[PDB]
Each structure stands twice: as structure tokens, then as C-alpha cells.
Amino acid sequence: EVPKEAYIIQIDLPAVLGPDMKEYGPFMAGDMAIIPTVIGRALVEREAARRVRIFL
């Protein structure tokens, strides 16, 4: 399975294919979403996303 986390998206973002062949997005700014970590982390370093921890 593909590792994924929850994020808050800071800006508008077009849809994007993931390593699991599923489409993530498109995102309105301020959306919270579970997305594959490879994409999410890159979005965070780009400052287009923030990690959020959902304790289960």
C-alpha cells in the first residue's frame, strides 16, 4: 500500500495523479485531505500544505 497522511492545503491546486494510480484533488484553498505522503511532503516543503495529525 501507498503511505499517505492528512494535510491542510494552503492554495488552490489542480488534480494530480498519485503512485497508486488514483487522482488526488483538485483542491480549493483551505481543504483538508488525505493524500499520498510523497506528494504531501513536497507540497509542505513548497509551503502549499501543512501536516495535520489525526489521532486514531
Binding site: 480549493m28 483551505g30 481543504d31 485531505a33 488525505i34 495529525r53 489525526i54 489521532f55 486514531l56
Partner: protein, 450 residues
């Protein structure tokens, strides 16, 4: 109230969501902006995440035709509306007919149900429930999540926060399906119900401010004036700088007795007096003295994050994210600072206002932000139309007008005429957005408007 018939719908919607999760589909969540909607969204997001599913949640002001168009163009397999949708059953059924939709809401619905299959309306109202006291949006979200998985009962407190935000306990106690939720919380030890001063500010406010802006109920000859609150508290032997939670139980009791005596002596209505002491929901999951420790204070925090276009941050706070709480504290503090600086700026620069026959117009330029306009006008009153350059647009000016009953003495309806002027200038019309290069033309058109 026919609870079984409601639970049928609940189980249906829940089953739909679980089906789409197991199919690996993205559960598209949409919820309202206030505490009820934010807590609802949190509950559903956790419900999805707990099944190892994927969601995408948006916190919106309201369901609009444009929003439904956007969601439609998204082309999802499943849309779940939380604390929204009941007034837009046809719309949703029209533009989202291609997909599974679930509406978990408690507002009086446009219809009894959706006409097509795979579209389920989870709403207690068509079963006899009272919209404003039997269950809130977060409450029905909670029912759905609980049907999805009993573990979601750990969101009970969150639900109740929403419930308090929606003022479901306006009469001092909870009713209907809310009660059920409360019991769940009690069974888990994640919430407790105290018989206490129902006012806002038991966790984060000085006693004098807790008494000062007390509404539901209001305290006669204390509500509004902080000075009289201080004097009254010092008179009865209380530390007015102390916070309510810091009081012992006996001290709280004495406060209740004193306040009740005061309200009886000053001719308060019986209803208000009966609403002074009652149910207050507390959670051991958070430290006492924390805003999240009490339902009303938590709801206040959430609403605050909602108004600042950060409803999702509030959602994260409900989900247990301490970092998000930190960021939210910083944000609210910065906002407060902006408000103070706005007051200082407008008072210091009241020499720039335009003298009108019917209104005052103060153009701040870029010095006061859009959102701070209204509260600036009020702060110019308690010491009127304020205008400011829009941060979003560039050629646009956003303005707000504030007034009192003394003006209503001779019509002077602001929102009435503001609509007219906005119509004449080519803008939306209360608050008004209009071309920055027509400000003069606005002023002349506003004095004549009244």
C-alpha cells in the same frame, strides 16, 4: 419522534459511505462554517480516516449554485454534506445526480427525501424532531459516524461542542437525541455535565468579563458595563480578576446565589433567571483552564477560526491536533492586535472623515483590512460608514455601515439604501463592495440615500 425511522436513514447513509470507502473512493466532505459545521466535518473526517479511507473536506459559508457547480465539475463518486444541504435537495439532486450523495443535516428540509436512489437524506426533522433542540448538525454527523463504527463514540464531546454552538441547550438543559450522545460521552469519561453558571468565559475569562458580556441570560445592570461588574464582584467578596474555573465549589455556589439575588432584585424576567444556572459540558481530555475544556468556550474558538477562513484548522483542532491549536492561538492573537491597532488608527485619524447630512464616511485606504472595517465603524461609534481597499481585488473598495436604534427612530435603514447605492455604482450591497474610483460618487449617493 420515531427514532427507528430516523436510524434507518442513518444506517443507510453510513452504509453508503462505508461502501465507497471499501471501494477505495475519495469521500468528498462539505461542511458549514460555524462550530456545528466544523465539528460535524471533524466527526465525518475521523469516521472516514478510521476505516482507512481517503477524504477531502471543505468548510464553506453556505451551499450555493456556484459551489454545487464546482463540486459537480470535480466529478466525485460520493459527496457528503454536513450541517448543510436540506434547503437545497433539488439542486443537489439536479447537479450531482451522477454520484452518490448523503446529506446529514438538521435544518428543515426542502423535501422529505431525495427522489433518486443512492441519494440519502439523513435528517431528523421529517421524523418529528425539533430542529433547534433535538439534534444539531454535528449530532447527526455523530449518529452516522457511530453507525459506521462504535469507536466514533469517542467524538461525543466534539458533537456536544457543536450542539452547544448551535445553542441546542438554550433553556439550560439538553433534549432529544442530544441526550443519547451525552450518555455516550459519560460512558467513556470524555465528558461530564455540571450544574453551573451557563455564561461564556469559565475557562479563559476574568469573572468581571464573564459577567460583563453575559447574554443568554443577560444580567441587568451588569451586562455591558465592566466597571459595574468589577465593583459588584469586589462588593460580594470575589476576586474579579480570578477566572471561574479557579473558584472552589462553595465559591461558585455563592456566586450563583449572589447573581440570582441580583437578577431577582432588578426585575429580570423569570426565563432569564431560570437560564442562569444549568448544564455546562466539561471534558477531562483537556486541562481545566483551557478553552477546549468547556463546550461553549471550545465552540467560541471554533467559530472564531471559522470567521477567519480557517475552519479546517478548527477541524484539525477537533481531531486532536495540538499544533493546529497553537497556530490558531497565534492567529487569533494577531487578529486581536490588528483590531486594537485599527481602533487606535481610526481614533487618531478621525480628522479625515467626511461630514454628511445623513452619514459619516471614513476612507482608511490600506491601513485597515477588509474584515476589520465593520468593527472599526462600531469602534468609531463607541468612542457611520468605513471604507477600505480590498485585499483580494485591487480596484475594489469594501465598506461597512453601523448604526443604533436612535437612527432607526426615523427609518435610516442602512442595508436598504446601501443596496440602492451599490446597485447604482455597479457593486454588491450591512456591507458594500464597489469601484474604488467612485468613492466620492458613493458619498454623495449615501447622504441622499437616507
Amino acid at each position: 419522534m420515531d427514532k427507528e425511522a430516523f436510524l434507518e436513514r442513518v444506517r443507510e447513509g453510513a452504509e453508503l459511505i462505508k461502501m465507497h470507502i471499501e471501494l477505495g473512493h475519495t469521500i468528498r466532505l462539505i461542511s458549514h462554517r460555524d462550530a456545528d459545521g466544523i465539528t460535524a466535518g471533524a466527526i465525518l473526517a475521523k469516521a472516514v480516516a478510521r476505516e482507512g479511507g481517503t477524504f477531502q473536506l471543505s468548510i464553506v459559508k453556505q451551499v450555493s449554485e456556484e459551489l454545487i457547480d464546482q463540486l459537480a465539475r470535480e466529478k466525485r463518486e460520493i459527496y457528503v454534506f454536513s450541517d448543510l444541504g436540506s434547503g437545497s435537495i433539488e439542486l443537489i439532486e439536479e447537479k450531482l445526480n451522477f454520484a452518490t450523495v448523503v446529506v446529514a443535516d438538521h435544518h428543515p428540509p426542502e423535501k422529505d427525501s431525495f427522489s433518486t436512489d443512492s441519494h440519502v437524506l439523513v435528517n431528523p426533522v421529517p421524523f418529528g424532531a425539533n430542529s433547534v433542540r433535538d439534534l444539531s448538525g454535528s449530532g447527526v454527523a455523530y449518529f452516522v459516524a457511530r453507525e459506521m463504527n462504535r469507536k466514533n463514540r469517542d467524538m461525543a464531546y466534539v458533537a456536544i461542542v457543536g450542539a452547544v454552538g448551535d445553542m441546542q441547550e438554550i433553556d439550560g438543559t439538553f433534549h432529544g437525541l442530544n441526550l443519547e450522545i451525552i450518555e455516550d460521552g459519560k460512558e467513556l469519561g470524555i465528558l461530564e455535565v455540571r450544574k453551573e453558571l451557563r455564561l461564556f468565559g469559565r475557562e479563559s475569562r476574568p469573572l468581571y468579563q464573564m459577567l460583563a458580556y453575559a447574554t443568554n441570560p443577560e444580567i441587568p445592570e451588569i451586562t455591558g458595563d465592566e466597571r459595574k461588574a468589577i465593583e459588584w464582584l469586589r462588593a460580594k467578596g470575589f476576586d474579579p480578576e480570578m477566572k471561574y474555573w479557579q473558584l472552589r465549589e462553595e465559591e461558585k455556589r455563592k456566586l450563583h446565589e449572589a447573581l440570582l439575588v441580583h437578577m431577582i432584585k432588578h426585575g429580570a424576567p423569570k426565563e432569564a433567571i431560570d437560564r442562569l444556572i444549568g448544564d455546562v459540558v466539561i471534558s477531562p481530555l483537556y486541562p481545566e483552564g483551557d478553552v477546549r475544556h468547556e463546550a461553549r468556550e471550545f465552540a467560541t474558538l471554533l467559530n472564531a477560526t471559522g470567521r477567519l477562513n480557517a475552519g479546517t484548522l478548527g477541524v484539525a483542532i477537533c481531531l486532536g491536533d495540538e499544533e493546529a491549536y497553537k497556530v490558531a492561538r497565534k492567529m487569533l492573537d494577531d487578529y486581536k492586535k490588528e483590531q486594537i491597532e485599527a481602533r487606535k488608527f481610526i481614533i487618531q485619524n478621525w480628522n479625515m472623515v467626511e461630514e454628511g447630512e445623513h452619514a459619516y464616511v471614513f476612507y482608511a485606504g490600506k491601513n485597515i483590512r477588509d474584515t476589520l472595517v465593520g468593527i472599526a465603524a462600531n469602534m468609531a461609534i463607541n468612542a457611520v460608514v468605513v471604507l477600505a481597499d480590498s485585499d483580494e481585488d485591487e480596484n475594489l473598495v469594501k465598506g461597512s455601515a453601523r448604526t443604533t436604534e436612535k437612527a432607526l427612530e426615523k427609518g435610516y435603514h442602512l442595508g436598504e439604501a446601501l443596496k440602492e447605492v451599490a446597485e447604482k455604482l455597479g457593486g454588491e450591497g450591512a456591507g458594500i463592495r464597489f469601484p474604488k474610483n467612485r468613492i466620492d460618487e458613493f458619498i454623495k449617493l449615501f447622504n441622499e440615500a437616507l
